[PDB]
Amino acid sequence: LNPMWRQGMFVLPFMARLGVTGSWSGWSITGETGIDPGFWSFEGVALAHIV
């Protein structure tokens, strides 16, 4: 009931669309928990673009 698109999210669904779905923080957007997304988390993608 509070998905990304109710929250004004714009780049997040493009990251999820090609397979980035979890945070280094432990959450995923499918609701699974305690996943480990490896380096290509949402954070890691953001850091790559900044580098």
Binding site: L1, N2, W5, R6, Q7, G8
Partner: protein, 51 residues
């Protein structure tokens, strides 16, 4: 009925219900959705279901 499916059947999530200068996330408008209240069934005094 999964709540996820009922939430799609609600006009707050229809993207053709906005405004150019109503800014921000959808939740700033109708609020952050918490729970489906259930399915309303209206009947008149003669026990007809109405729509």
């Amino acid at each position: 009925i999964p709540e996820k499916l009922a939430f799609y059947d609600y006009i707050g999530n229809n993207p053709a219900k906005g405004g150019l200068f109503r800014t921000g996330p959808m939740n700033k408008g109708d609020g952050i959705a918490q729970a489906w209240k259930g399915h309303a069934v209206f009947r008149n005094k003669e026990g007809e279901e109405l729509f």
